[PDB]
Design a protein around this ligand. Structure first.
Ligand SMILES: Cc1ncc(COP(=O)(O)O)c(CNCCCCCC(=O)O)c1O
Ligand code: PLP
Lengths: 453, 451
């Protein structure tokens, strides 16, 4: 019984067509080193996604591995319930609060981004009950946002693939437009006027729903899984004025943007967001351990704290909340990002990545090249004027990604956009290789389609 | 500035009164070894809870620590999305399926129990939509059950502490009786007749709701966080006959019971449960890594698989699903439990624990002593005839737990019950020490309550 046969036999894979998987089986990844991973045939791939937008320090950072060992050999597991605590969680929470781009009060730890956002939802409901506003419960998020996949966080999420078949979203989870100019702007509309229209949409939703019923607005500073969607100029400024106008919390989902991905330490800095709550994960630990953190500002903490007293204790927490190994690894991870000036380095590598891709700006199949910092995407189209896909939506993206993999590079297609989110430690010449392999995949795709013109 | 001051300054603690925490600060745990943990003053405590019902191999197992190192140095992170895979997840899934107490088809991994049960809820909804039964969505769980704390898993949960202030439960999450004879039986009613009445309650709920609307029944074989509640004789047999009668899935939440806690490898074995779905965590990895697993049987998998094809892909998964380090650690963990025959050893230590606690059966504040295997609780009361609490429910439990800690033992109070769920590696004399420290806490509690 071979290893692929066992995988087919025993594992139900996430984000995978189960029947198709029974036919093709897995691609088994055996080992990692630097920005590379190698399959069970010995073939090497540049992991241009950093796994899942996450492996900031790459796939063989010994300092993270040692930090884990040291913590294992001290205290391999403990918890934070009932006043219990431990050093790694305490020092990580300290670090996170002091590096926060706006004044923050407290950290709450979870294992995952989905748990974190699920927890934010509950916290907001608990908060507003504590403040005597029991109607103020609804969340507003965006079409194509991704915020995880619990019953509640999938309701925040605005990708239909996370909702069809699942009876989601739940009631009370509202959606407004995807701020993607290329796709949803009217013909000859400015970024700024698009932003205006989106802010008016949101004010209109709030009034139709009754402002007293709206608790919070949540958004990724720029949307990751939904297509590396950079919001238009002035979006965040104008969306926030609306939120403050009706006393609505602003939650920044920084699970992908956090820790140097967008050219600065947080997407909230890059895009001028003053969030009341931040959600962090992925680069927090370069995914070497599962860990997420929620940062809450003073007003949010004080209301929650009052209620936890009235009710005896805060009735919430995961067994793994603040896990000493995961928190110890994250702490070292963050120190490395500081000590090696990887935010600034990522910004530079991001400029290289983008320039390299921009040699293809006038290619007949390239509709848009977008990104900032060290996150980017190239959205392919069948026709540039109409912006229509070749064959069905997704066809080009799937073909590109398959070619890229053939050429030793792992990228994820989101419809017809192919994404780049490489490790922060990527060096100049590695950026070159990434772009080369993108180009070879585009070439193959171009021969396959035969654009002519 | 000092480490407690930082914790107070920067951390919001789960299951903690936040204001009281701003006053007292934390109890900082610095290191662990065997069944013990030590605070930052050097004081040692027997961890009679095994942390959170979870640290099966204790707090310094080098084999788990090595397995982690070896995996870290091979592949420290990867994922299972889009047909990607890796050895540890594959070999763990294999092991879990082959050791399952009933035929199972597939494993799906999450980080936590709460995520797991949340995922089970979605899977059941996805399944029944696939089968063209869009009305069949409601879950039935029990009062005082605990199944985690996401918006959906907290709705499954039946402890009001997890719901007050959170606008839970959601609609479609139904609750039937806690199967706790001591509290809910009528006078002089047998365990068997109590079980009959509970099965009738469930059939009646199903009919009142419309059977076509009921997707699933979920239960911990015995309830952990709700008070170490052992169901009465014949409960599970009779509850299952009702569920099969209306084609209702039976989900066993084995997050605590799993891997030797109840005298056998699974609570499903100990209590005669034939679940369609099982949820595992905690002792899965001795909590050295965050990991949970869902085991689904063939019919559940086949329906989901069909739908994931129709819809392009199964639109669900956590970044950490099947994390190579966490799965590698769990795999080694399970091997150790087998190689060291810890299920059988835990059973023996459980007999010692329970007989040691029984010396207090006639104490004026002891209302009930319960448990099986290596899980147990002593429920204190202010008055044995009336079963009423001293002052208010929880007052005794909070005092006991504080005294136990003073006497070098960490136990958790669930209301006025104090629990025992020590590491499986606990030895005979350590069981004695646990019982002795319980006894010293009870003495203190007894003098405190006074005349
Ligand atoms: C039976 C059961 N099922 C699910 C979960 C959730 O696990 P997670 O914490 O999400 O990984 C649990 C968890 N147990 C911890 C006990 C907390 C209850 C409060 C208390 O101990 O008083 C369990 O047990
Ligand atoms: C991947 C992701 C999540 C969910 O994280 P998990 O740990 O996979 O639950 C949440 N938010 C964003 C923006 C993400 O990209």
């Amino acid at each position: 019984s071979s290893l692929p046969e066992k995988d087919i036999q025993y594992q139900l894979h996430p984000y995978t067509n189960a029947r198709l998987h029974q036919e093709l089986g897995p691609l088994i990844i055996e080992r990692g080193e630097g920005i590379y991973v190698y399959d069970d045939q010995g073939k090497g791939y540049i992991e241009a996604m950093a796994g899942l937008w996450s492996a900031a320090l790459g796939f063989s950072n010994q300092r993270l591995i040692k930090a884990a060992e040291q913590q294992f050999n001290t205290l391999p597991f403990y918890h934070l319930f009932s006043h219990k605590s431990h050093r790694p969680s305490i020092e990580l929470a300290e670090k996170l609060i002091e590096m926060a781009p706006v004044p923050m009060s407290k950290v709450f730890f979870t294992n995952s981004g989905s748990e974190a956002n699920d927890t934010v939802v509950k916290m907001v409901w608990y908060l507003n009950n504590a403040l005597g506003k029991p109607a103020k419960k609804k969340f507003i998020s965006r079409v194509n946002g991704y915020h995880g996949i619990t019953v509640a966080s999938a309701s925040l999420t605005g990708l239909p693939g996370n909702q069809r078949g699942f009876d989601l979203p739940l009631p009370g989870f509202l959606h407004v437009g995807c701020p993607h100019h290329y796709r949803f702007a009217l013909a000859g509309e400015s970024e700024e006027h698009f932003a205006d229209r989106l802010a008016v949409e949101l004010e209109q939703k709030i009034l139709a729903e009754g402002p007293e019923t709206i608790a919070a607005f949540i958004g990724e500073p720029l949307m990751g899984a939904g297509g590396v969607i950079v919001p238009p100029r002035t979006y965040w400024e104008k969306i926030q004025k609306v939120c403050r106008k009706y006393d609505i919390l602003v939650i920044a989902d920084e699970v992908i943007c956090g820790f140097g991905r967008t050219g600065q330490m947080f997407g909230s800095q890059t895009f001028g967001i003053q969030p009341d709550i931040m959600v962090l994960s992925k680069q927090l630990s370069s995914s070497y351990q599962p860990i997420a953190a929620i940062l809450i500002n003073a007003p949010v903490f004080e209301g929650i704290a009052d209620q936890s007293q009235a009710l005896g204790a805060l009735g919430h927490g995961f067994t793994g909340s603040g896990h000493p190994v995961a928190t110890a690894v994250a702490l070292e991870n963050l120190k490395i990002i500081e000590e090696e000036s990887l935010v600034e380095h990522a910004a530079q590598m991001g400029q290289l990545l983008r320039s390299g891709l921009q040699h293809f700006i006038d290619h007949p199949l390239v509709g848009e090249i977008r990104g900032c910092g060290l996150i980017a995407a190239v959205e392919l189209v069948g026709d540039r004027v109409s912006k229509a896909p070749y064959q069905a939506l997704g066809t080009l993206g799937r073909y590109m990604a398959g070619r890229a993999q053939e050429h030793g590079m792992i990228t994820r297609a989101m419809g017809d956009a192919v994404a780049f989110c490489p490790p922060l430690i990527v060096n100049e010449q590695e950026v070159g290789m990434i772009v080369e392999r993108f180009a070879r995949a585009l070439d193959d795709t171009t021969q396959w389609v035969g654009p002519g013109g």
